[PDB]
């Protein structure tokens with residue numbers, strides 16, 4: 001809604017993405033899925049760069065403290081309580097789900113906010129997140145499906 | 150499983166609980182649900198005290214870094230994407246769900262670990278988390294159910 005609120009969301013979304021992607025990179029690497037690990041390093045790096053841009057913008061404003069559910073990635077499928085996310089197919093899909101949630105926040109903000117800057121950044125940020133979803137879709141396509149057991 | 154692993158879980162569970170309870174306390178207070186806010190302040194305080202105990206234990210060991218899904222509270226019901234958790238009935242049930250997940254981790258560790266200390270702390274910690282669930286059940290009983298609209 002407001003630009004302060006929007007920038008708080010954007011920073012939180014990016015801080016979260018950086019952490020979650022490093023974590024996924026680490027897991028890919030540890031099981032020698034080096035290509036997928038690198039997709040996630042790239043994404044974690046984009047988070048840092050983009051987050052830094054948003055942080056420069058936000059120096060002008062007093063930002064609200066957000067609640068965790070406003071920005072955290074959704075918890076993944078809960079089996080058997082603990083792995084599933086160690087396979088590339090499942091990590092990529094998890095990452096994609098949350099890329100989409102971030103995209104949707106940006107699109108919703110750009111549509112419903114009266115502040116033209118929120119409209120502008122929301123649209124810009126949504127378009128870029130959309131390119132991430134498309135890129136992850138291309139990966140998921142080429143990624144073989146694992147079997148349980 | 151191992152004591153290092155167990156203590157890493159316990160610390161993470163408590164760091165997480167403290168943050169989540171402060172957050173819920175803040176929301177209760179902000180809507181003048183002062184009794185429920187205080188239940189959550191009490192819990193956040195228990196986290197700090199208990200976490201500090203676990204931290205003293207863990208100085209003896211190199212702890213593994215855990216993945217977020219190993220210790221984070223589950224994300225709450227996702228509607229309409231954003232509130233629901235501002236009502237006491239919904240915050241208490243959310244808190245209870247995650248108290249139960251923590252209890253279950255402790256019980257599972259105590260049952261499946263060969264290390265007698267993990268067995269001992271796991272049982273001790275599970276029994277106390279169980280008292281928290283029972284306390285939240287008593288609250289949920291006395292808490293009126295809200296209506297949407």
Ligand SMILES: [Zn+2]
Pocket residue numbers: 099128129132
């Ligand atoms: Zn993205």
Ligand SMILES: [Zn+2]
Pocket residue numbers: 248277278281
């Ligand atoms: Zn508890």
